[PDB]
Every structure is written in C-alpha cells, then in structure tokens.
Design a protein around this ligand. Structure first.
Ligand SMILES: [Ca+2]
Ligand SMILES: [Zn+2]
Ligand SMILES: [Zn+2]
Ligand SMILES: [Zn+2]
Ligand SMILES: [Zn+2]
Lengths: 161, 158
C-alpha cells in the first residue's frame, strides 16, 4: 500500500456497530463456531441493514465468514443502498471479505482488531478508495485469541491454511 | 502444477462443467454464471455451482462463491493445487476468495461482458489467469444482460 494512508475518523455510530458486531461474534462462539461477527450500518441514520457471524461450523460453510454472512443477511439490495454505509467486523478482513466490501462499494470498514489476524486486505481497502478504522477492541481480541488457542486447526481452516 | 502457459489436461473438462452450470442457472431463471473447482493432482471435480442470487435471494452466492460453498469445508492444503473455472472474469469478491484460499489457477470463460480489477490483481498476487474467450459463455451471458440489465447490475453492485 501507500505511505500516505491514514486511519479514518470516528463515526457517531461506531460504538453501536462494534457492539452489534461483538455480540454476533459472542453468539457464534457460544454456538460452537468461529467468533467473528459483523453488521452493516447506514452512516446517515444508523439503521442496521443486517448483522451476522461466521457459519463455517454451524452450516458446514466454506464461504460464510462473518463479513460474508453479514452481507448475506442484509439480503438482495440495489447497488445504491451500499453507498455511505459502514461494514463493522470484529476482525481485520481476509482477502475475500475485503473483496466483498470493494465489489459492493461499501465505503467504510471499522475493524475490531488486527492483532490476531491481518491480511493484505486491510491496506488494499485503502488503496481501492475505502476508509478503514481499527479500534483495537479488547473484547474482540480476547475472544478471538481464545478460539485460536483452543482450536488452532479449526481457525486454520477458516483462513485456508 | 506449473503450466508455463500450457493448458492443463483438465482445463476443457473444467470449462465445460462451468458452462453447464451457467446454462442450468439460466434455465432456473438466474444469472448465467457457473464454475467448478478441480483438483489438479488427479482431475477430480471437488465441486461445481452457479450464481444463486435469484434462486435463493442471495447477495453473496456469485457463481465462484457458490462453487466453493458446494465443495464443502476442506483442508487448506487441498486448495493449493486446484484450478477454479468460471464462465466470467471474477469480481473483486470472487477474486478475493481465490486469493484467500490460495487457488493457484483461475481459468476464465470470457472477460468481454465483464471484467473487474480482480483479473489483474490475481496476477499481482501470483496466480495464473487464463482467459479462454469461450463463445458459448459469452453468448449466454450477453443474452441475460440484454434481457435483464437491472438484475445484472444488481449482481455486480451497480
Ligand atoms: Ca474520506
Ligand atoms: Zn475474516
Ligand atoms: Zn474473510
Ligand atoms: Zn462474477
Ligand atoms: Zn463475484
């Protein structure tokens, strides 16, 4: 990426979005799955278009990462609806989830943390014209580290290793 | 597998299956984009699929994503020696799926009706991209775009 990128500014809906994303990650964790959750919010009025969490174990899914599940839960939408929205995710996006954000033109991504995992997508989002904010949420870091430590092979599967 | 530009012995089989999936999706009333994932080691078809936007009201099941979903959960190393066949050049999301899983080769039916920055990004990231320019794929895709432009735009977030 570029030496001139900078983290985005905070939005009035960030506490709301991160809290929903974390709640989804915790729900997934209690269900026996990967603790990664998210939600898509309209930056203009704070409305929640959808929310979701990873469904790899719940549904035997190779594509339902938390971010993809969130978008699936928003349902079919005209392209214009994704404009001026923020996708909240508890963990920095992989290359696939990053690609979903780019394809739909969701302009902003707020990331719970990038300590347990980070792909080239975090910077690629900025290269492609998207704003990224990493909030370093301790709740997210704790639950994700717990999963990685207790079920390493399951985590590796989620990121294709 | 290291082709050096040569087609893989399984490439025709993969593109024919991808086209069959696209044709099936078209008959089901959906977007005519299909694909399949083949194990380069033995030619086994790990899975095949097509776009399910209309069939399932899905915002994420593009042909490539549906193909991967249909393969089921797999050990990461399996993907490292596969080829993903798609009837149409991948959008940024499908490109990202290929990159995340480390699928080394992406064989594309055509990139005339659609092409994203993903086709070149795959190359930047070290993957081999093959564009066949398959007229069967091009024809069915063009028919859908001609008949249902707004539905097509919805599939690519326009
Ligand atoms: Ca800005
Ligand atoms: Zn992820
Ligand atoms: Zn992901
Ligand atoms: Zn596509
Ligand atoms: Zn796609």
């Amino acid at each position: 990426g570029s030496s001139m990128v900078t983290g985005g500014m905070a939005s009035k809906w960030d506490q709301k979005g991160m809290d929903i994303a974390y709640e989804e990650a915790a729900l997934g964790y209690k269900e026996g799955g990967v603790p990664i959750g998210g939600c898509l919010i309209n930056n203009k009025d704070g409305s929640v278009l959808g929310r979701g969490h990873n469904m790899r174990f719940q549904k035997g899914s190779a594509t339902l990462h938390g971010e993809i599940s969130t978008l699936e839960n928003c349902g079919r939408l005209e392209g214009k609806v994704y404009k001026d929205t923020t996708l909240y995710t508890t963990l920095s996006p992989c290359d696939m989830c990053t690609g979903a954000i780019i394809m739909y033109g969701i302009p902003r991504c707020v990331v719970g943390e990038n300590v347990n995992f980070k792909s080239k997508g975090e910077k690629y989002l900025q290269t492609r014209g998207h704003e990224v904010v990493v909030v370093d949420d301790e709740r997210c870091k704790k639950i994700m580290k717990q999963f990685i430590d207790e079920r390493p092979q399951d985590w590796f599967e989620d990121i294709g290793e």
